[PDB]
Amino acid sequence: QSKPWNRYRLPTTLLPDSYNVTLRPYLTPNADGLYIFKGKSIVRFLCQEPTDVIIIHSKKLNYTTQGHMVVLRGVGDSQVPEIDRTELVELTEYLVVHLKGSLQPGHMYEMESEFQGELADDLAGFYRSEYMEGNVKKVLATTQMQSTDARKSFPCFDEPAMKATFNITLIHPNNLTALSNMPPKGSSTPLAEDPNWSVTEFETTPVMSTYLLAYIVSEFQSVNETAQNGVLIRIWARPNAIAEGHGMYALNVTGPILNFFANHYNTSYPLPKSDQIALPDFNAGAMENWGLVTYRENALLFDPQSSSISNKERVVTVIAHELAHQWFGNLVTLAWWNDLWLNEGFASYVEYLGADHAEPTWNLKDLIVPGDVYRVMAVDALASSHPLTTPAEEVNTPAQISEMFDSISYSKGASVIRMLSNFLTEDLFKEGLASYLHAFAYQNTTYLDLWEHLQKAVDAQTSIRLPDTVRAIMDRWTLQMGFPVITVDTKTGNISQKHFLLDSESNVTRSSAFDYLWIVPISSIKNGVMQDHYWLRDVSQAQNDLFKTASDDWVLLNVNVTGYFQVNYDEDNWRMIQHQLQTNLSVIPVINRAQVIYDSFNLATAHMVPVTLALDNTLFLNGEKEYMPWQAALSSLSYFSLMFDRSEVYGPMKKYLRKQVEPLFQHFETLTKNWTERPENLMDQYSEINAISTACSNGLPQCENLAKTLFDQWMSDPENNPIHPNLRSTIYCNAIAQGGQDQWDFAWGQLQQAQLVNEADKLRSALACSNEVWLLNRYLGYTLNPDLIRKQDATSTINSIASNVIGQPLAWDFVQSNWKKLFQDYGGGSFSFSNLIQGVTRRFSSEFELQQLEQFKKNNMDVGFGSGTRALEQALEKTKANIKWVKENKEVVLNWFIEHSS
Amino acid sequence: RPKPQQFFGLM
Ligand SMILES: *[C@@H]1O[C@H](CO)[C@@H](O[C@@H]2O[C@H](CO)[C@@H](O[C@@H]3O[C@H](CO)[C@@H](O)[C@H](O)[C@H]3NC(C)=O)[C@H](O)[C@H]2NC(C)=O)[C@H](O)[C@H]1NC(C)=O
Ligand SMILES: *[C@@H]1O[C@H](CO)[C@@H](O[C@@H]2O[C@H](CO)[C@@H](O[C@@H]3O[C@H](CO)[C@@H](O)[C@H](O)[C@H]3NC(C)=O)[C@H](O)[C@H]2NC(C)=O)[C@H](O)[C@H]1NC(C)=O
Ligand SMILES: *[C@@H]1O[C@H](CO)[C@@H](O[C@@H]2O[C@H](CO)[C@@H](O[C@@H]3O[C@H](CO)[C@@H](O)[C@H](O)[C@H]3NC(C)=O)[C@H](O)[C@H]2NC(C)=O)[C@H](O)[C@H]1NC(C)=O
Ligand SMILES: *[C@@H]1O[C@H](CO)[C@@H](O[C@@H]2O[C@H](CO)[C@@H](O)[C@H](O)[C@H]2NC(C)=O)[C@H](O)[C@H]1NC(C)=O
Ligand SMILES: *[C@@H]1O[C@H](CO)[C@@H](O[C@@H]2O[C@H](CO)[C@@H](O)[C@H](O)[C@H]2NC(C)=O)[C@H](O)[C@H]1NC(C)=O
Ligand SMILES: *[C@@H]1O[C@H](CO)[C@@H](O[C@@H]2O[C@H](CO)[C@@H](O)[C@H](O)[C@H]2NC(C)=O)[C@H](O)[C@H]1NC(C)=O
Ligand SMILES: *[C@@H]1O[C@H](CO)[C@@H](O[C@@H]2O[C@H](CO)[C@@H](O)[C@H](O)[C@H]2NC(C)=O)[C@H](O)[C@H]1NC(C)=O
Ligand SMILES: *[C@@H]1O[C@H](CO)[C@@H](O[C@@H]2O[C@H](CO)[C@@H](O)[C@H](O)[C@H]2NC(C)=O)[C@H](O)[C@H]1NC(C)=O
Ligand SMILES: *[C@@H]1O[C@H](CO)[C@@H](O[C@@H]2O[C@H](CO)[C@@H](O)[C@H](O)[C@H]2NC(C)=O)[C@H](O)[C@H]1NC(C)=O
Ligand SMILES: *[C@@H]1O[C@H](CO)[C@@H](O)[C@H](O)[C@H]1NC(C)=O
Ligand SMILES: *[C@@H]1O[C@H](CO)[C@@H](O)[C@H](O)[C@H]1NC(C)=O
Ligand SMILES: [Zn+2]
Numbered sequence A: 001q002s003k004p005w006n007r008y009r010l011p012t013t014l015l016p017d018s019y020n021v022t023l024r025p026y027l028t029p030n031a032d033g034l035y036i037f038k039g040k041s042i043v044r045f046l047c048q049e050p051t052d053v054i055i056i057h058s059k060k061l062n063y064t065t066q067g068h069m070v071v072l073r074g075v076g077d078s079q080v081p082e083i084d085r086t087e088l089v090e091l092t093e094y095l096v097v098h099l100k101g102s103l104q105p106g107h108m109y110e111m112e113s114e115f116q117g118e119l120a121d122d123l124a125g126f127y128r129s130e131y132m133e134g135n136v137k138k139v140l141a142t143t144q145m146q147s148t149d150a151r152k153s154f155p156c157f158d159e160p161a162m163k164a165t166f167n168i169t170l171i172h173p174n175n176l177t178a179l180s181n182m183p184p185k186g187s188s189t190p191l192a193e194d195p196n197w198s199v200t201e202f203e204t205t206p207v208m209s210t211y212l213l214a215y216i217v218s219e220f221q222s223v224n225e226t227a228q229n230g231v232l233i234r235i236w237a238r239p240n241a242i243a244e245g246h247g248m249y250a251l252n253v254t255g256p257i258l259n260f261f262a263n264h265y266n267t268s269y270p271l272p273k274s275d276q277i278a279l280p281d282f283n284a285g286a287m288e289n290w291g292l293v294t295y296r297e298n299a300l301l302f303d304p305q306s307s308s309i310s311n312k313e314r315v316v317t318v319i320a321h322e323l324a325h326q327w328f329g330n331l332v333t334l335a336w337w338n339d340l341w342l343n344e345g346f347a348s349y350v351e352y353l354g355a356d357h358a359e360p361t362w363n364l365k366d367l368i369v370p371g372d373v374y375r376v377m378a379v380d381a382l383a384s385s386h387p388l389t390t391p392a393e394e395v396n397t398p399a400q401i402s403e404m405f406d407s408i409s410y411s412k413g414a415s416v417i418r419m420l421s422n423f424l425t426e427d428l429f430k431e432g433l434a435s436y437l438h439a440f441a442y443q444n445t446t447y448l449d450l451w452e453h454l455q456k457a458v459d460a461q462t463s464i465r466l467p468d469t470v471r472a473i474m475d476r477w478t479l480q481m482g483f484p485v486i487t488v489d490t491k492t493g494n495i496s497q498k499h500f501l502l503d504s505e506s507n508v509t510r511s512s513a514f515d516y517l518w519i520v521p522i523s524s525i526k527n528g529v530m531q532d533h534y535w536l537r538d539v540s541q542a543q544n545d546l547f548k549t550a551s552d553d554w555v556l557l558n559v560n561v562t563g564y565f566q567v568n569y570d571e572d573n574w575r576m577i578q579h580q581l582q583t584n585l586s587v588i589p590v591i592n593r594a595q596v597i598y599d600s601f602n603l604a605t606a607h608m609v610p611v612t613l614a615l616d617n618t619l620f621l622n623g624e625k626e627y628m629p630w631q632a633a634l635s636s637l638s639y640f641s642l643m644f645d646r647s648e649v650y651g652p653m654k655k656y657l658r659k660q661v662e663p664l665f666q667h668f669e670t671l672t673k674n675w676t677e678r679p680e681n682l683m684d685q686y687s688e689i690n691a692i693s694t695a696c697s698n699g700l701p702q703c704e705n706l707a708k709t710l711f712d713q714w715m716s717d718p719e720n721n722p723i724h725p726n727l728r729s730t731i732y733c734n735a736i737a738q739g740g741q742d743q744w745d746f747a748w749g750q751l752q753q754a755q756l757v758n759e760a761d762k763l764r765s766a767l768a769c770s771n772e773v774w775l776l777n778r779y780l781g782y783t784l785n786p787d788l789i790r791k792q793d794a795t796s797t798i799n800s801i802a803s804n805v806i807g808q809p810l811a812w813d814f815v816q817s818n819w820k821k822l823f824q825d826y827g828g829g830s831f832s833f834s835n836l837i838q839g840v841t842r843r844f845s846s847e848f849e850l851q852q853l854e855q856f857k858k859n860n861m862d863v864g865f866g867s868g869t870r871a872l873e874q875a876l877e878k879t880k881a882n883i884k885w886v887k888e889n890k891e892v893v894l895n896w897f898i899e900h901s902s
Numbered sequence B: 001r002p003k004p005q006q007f008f009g010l011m
Helices: A239-243 A247-264 A309-324 A337-358 A363-379 A398-402 A406-426 A426-440 A448-460 A471-480 A572-584 A590-605 A611-616 A621-622 A627-642 A649-672 A681-697 A701-716 A730-736 A739-753 A755-765 A773-780 A790-805 A808-818 A834-841 A847-857 A871-900
Strands: A012-024 A036-047 A051-057 A073-076 A085-091 A095-105 A108-118 A126-134 A137-144 A165-173 A177-180 A196-199 A217-218 A221-226 A232-237 A273-279 A290-296 A484-489 A496-500 A520-521 A524-526 A534-536 A541-543 A555-557 A566-569
Touching: A095 A108, A137 A290, A165 A177, A165 A217, A177 A627, A217 A290, A221 A247, A221 A273, A232 A239, A232 A247, A232 A773, A247 A273, A247 A309, A247 A337, A273 A309, A290 A309, A290 A398, A309 A337, A309 A363, A309 A681, A337 A363, A337 A790, A363 A406, A363 A590, A363 A627, A398 A755, A406 A426, A406 A448, A406 A471, A406 A520, A406 A790, A426 A448, A426 A484, A448 A471, A448 A566, A471 A590, A471 A871, A484 A520, A484 A555, A555 A566, A566 A572, A566 A590, A566 A871, A572 A611, A572 A621, A590 A627, A611 A871, A621 A649, A627 A649, A627 A681, A649 A681, A649 A701, A649 A871, A681 A701, A681 A730, A701 A730, A701 A739, A730 A755, A739 A755, A755 A790, A773 A790, A773 A808, A808 A834, A834 A871, A847 A871
Parallel strands: A012 A165, A232 A273, A273 A290, A484 A566
Antiparallel strands: A012 A036, A036 A108, A051 A095, A073 A108, A085 A095, A126 A137, A137 A217, A165 A196, A177 A217, A221 A232, A484 A496, A496 A541, A520 A534, A524 A555
């Protein structure tokens, strides 16, 4: 019989009711350089079943409580047993209070403690963040509880289902602002023991999870809006960022987004206020703390003067994502981390819906397809993938919990939920969603609860008919990994499904309860006209006339790629599709014009179509003005460039892409009035960005001319940059590529004086575009100088140099020679040896290069590889795959490009 | 924690 304090899950014998927590960060170090926080807490809990032990979470806390580590009292007139002893059990992160008698069912108890911890710069629990304002190093205190770190700030029953109300008090320097989940109760009062400090009490939280608590002490200022319903909206940031107006876009979109969600969810925003705060270098990206959402600065702030349209899109979607959680996740909370995919998957889908509401002309909802669907299919088409669902009993330790937060959980989660909403219809999905939120408000759920409420909505109507229960259908998409390729023979209308793997030689060893068969919702378009919807049942092969064609007709499946699968056709149908796109592309929805490209390249990788069929699918692009299909092609061809840009294949490839993109360049040349004014909507701006990128990188003289002229103009007047932020990355790069040390030194100067990270990033990247060996070598010589290149930017810069075909050997020589820097940078910040190894060896595709990677590895004796260990093994494995791919594809691909470049 | 995801992704 194992002791309960040696088990990772808490007993269910005691449940929390409410907590008082007072925290006091000390933002001045103790002279040895240690920063601490002090705290005091009282938790009131109810005894459900008799027990003589209290087990509560505690991590890295020292107790200063009088007597034992806690004091234990009865609520009202309840008696309390005496404490035998208190002990900390570090492995399972518990404070354990052994009692001399048993607590009694139905009785409430209050347990008080006093404690302190390090206010470490570790982004965990209550922690410190250091940044610069002019001459001064500033330090603030802030929180990150996600997932199991509330217990690092105060002792608590730190599991998400164990909800309670929280009364937070902050004790802080009197000239700093204190924020938490709720509004402050009133004005701060001076601390009696030292009036240099103030005390800020916050209103009681709703019933809520520990992982969603937040409290922050800083010098931050805000911009504000009061919504019509009295809800106060604030964006918080560094005083200088606020003063420059960088919080305005976030402020602009927040009101509309909250309004969208209240309506979408049929549920009022559950808090009196909304704070969002931009933190410098918040590595977690963003965190949905209820009423006080934290973001890295570059995710929330926006500078219209220097930021591109893609920055704007990042802000509105990141906001919509975190605000989505203020209902789904925070109001109704998944009972355990094994169901994290539902929470993050749901937010990862509806972020597009929320953002679309704020920017209705942007067609943002489309972006889930390239952004999430095809992104996650890359890793879900591997034998090494995993199902969305995990048994709760397999997820116990904080490490196992962290593993829940991956591409599958977020992106496949979003994909399958989007598929679900689509086959139910949004109206029906929303009914079940509202029912679910209403039923479980301030409580906890599993994914089965959502399915049940969606089933109730289906059962209450007669229009939408499903081939099975919602649960049975969704089980196919959640209980087994991967997805099917749907293959259609249009001569017969025969339709088949099989588990899709990119590696046709791969062995799947993870068994499925369903033998890798799905229940698949299949929409289709025939000759541009929508057909009746179809469901492929759990069978390998079926037949339907919907998918049978005449000689001159065509069919296309999975309209707008709402379904989580890829489609293959017989060659005849592929040609009819190709013919349609060649003569009138408008007949096929833009998303599907992209899908044809995405799927065919994947199918070619899997040896299900010849690579030439996939390349044939790019032929229509000379008449394509829209973003997504061009994006599909560029994404699919980046590997081709990577394998071939040092070979005889490259000339014909460059020429072919010049032929394809020249008309688009011409189109935008006129549309933009000689480049003086951007296209109006987001998609058209993205298309222009990619068009100029593709034209210049493939050597279109007109683009090269544009880049030289603008950069010359900039050099003639450094303070007035004539290059629109959307075009900076391309214009900078191509101009530095054309020029020498004059263009290089100018951009270097601009980089050194750059006040803004995103602009500094563009400049750093563009400096790697030089075609002068001596410049790229000198530049490599800077990457390790922290006065010239930030340590956190070093590997990125080397990678950018490696990406330059000329820089490739230079960077590889640099990494080998200076690998004697692992013992200077496994302790001096991470560095990321893993990402650096992958970037520099990315191109390797020959036996000779494999020999060099092996010979470099022959320094196994000492120094090792660190966090890049086995990333080095990944590189050796990938090189082998590349060798095999180039050998199989070189001849066929060379001839295709030659043939189709006029 | 925050993920929208960057809008490329394709193997
Ligand atoms: C969690 O924190 C709460 C906020 O501090 C505590 O509630 C407060 O308790 C105070 C006294 O313990 C009350 O303040 C005043 O104290 C004088 C002492 O001289 C009393 O006589 C008065 O009753 C009281 N003043 C008034 C106007 O009633 C606060 O009233 C009270 N605040 C509330 C209820 O919002 C909780 O006690 C604390 N929880 C635990 C378990 O200790
Ligand atoms: C929680 O309690 C821990 C154990 O008491 C503390 O960790 C200890 O910190 C001590 C003081 O900083 C260290 O001991 C010695 O301290 C003196 C004076 O600062 C130094 O001259 C010595 O070099 C130092 N000794 C050593 C070996 O470094 C200990 O390092 C350390 N002890 C242990 C067992 O880890 C935590 O500091 C404390 N945390 C908080 C937030 O209060
Ligand atoms: C947050 O929302 C605000 C209100 O919608 C936006 O304010 C708008 O800013 C626009 C860009 O600066 C202005 O457009 C034009 O600016 C030029 C440059 O000076 C002028 O020639 C034009 O006269 C002017 N607009 C018009 C319609 O003539 C808008 O004036 C202004 N709109 C309003 C209603 O005040 C903010 O831009 C927005 N912030 C962000 C970052 O998006
Ligand atoms: C946190 O503050 C709230 C609000 O003041 C406290 O709620 C009160 O609790 C007492 C004792 O159980 C009740 O008699 C009152 O009815 C409650 N008031 C309200 C408005 O709900 C709560 O007890 C506090 N938490 C702790 C741990 O003391
Ligand atoms: C809050 O008060 C503190 C202390 O008076 C200020 O911190 C000092 O700021 C000056 C620069 O103005 C520095 O030279 C000192 O080193 C700081 N002292 C300490 C102990 O850190 C702080 O600037 C004030 N902040 C605001 C927003 O008013
Ligand atoms: C949630 O949805 C319900 C049901 O649709 C809303 O109630 C309806 O509101 C409209 C507003 O004009 C009325 O015409 C209907 O008669 C109402 N239906 C019912 C059954 O009451 C409700 O307003 C929504 N609530 C929130 C908080 O968004
Ligand atoms: C986790 O969630 C469930 C609901 O899904 C909670 O159980 C409900 O509790 C409420 C309020 O006491 C009751 O009215 C319901 O009848 C319960 N529903 C059930 C048992 O299905 C449960 O309390 C939550 N767990 C914790 C630890 O709070
Ligand atoms: C389409 O599917 C049908 C089966 O439903 C295939 O036709 C069958 O072929 C086998 C060959 O052994 C015969 O024994 C069956 O009697 C046939 N069934 C018929 C004619 O109804 C057909 O080959 C498939 N065509 C494809 C995949 O292109
Ligand atoms: C496929 O996606 C497109 C968007 O890419 C959808 O087109 C939108 O349709 C709605 C309703 O008909 C309109 O309000 C929008 O203005 C359309 N946008 C564009 C850019 O055309 C289309 O509805 C989707 N097709 C299907 C069958 O769902
Ligand atoms: C899969 O198993 C077969 C044995 O039938 C083997 O030939 C092959 O190398 C294995 N792995 C891969 C990646 O193909
Ligand atoms: C092509 O098809 C679109 C969509 O049906 C139609 O609006 C357009 O008139 C057609 N264009 C030509 C040149 O036939
Ligand atoms: Zn999220």
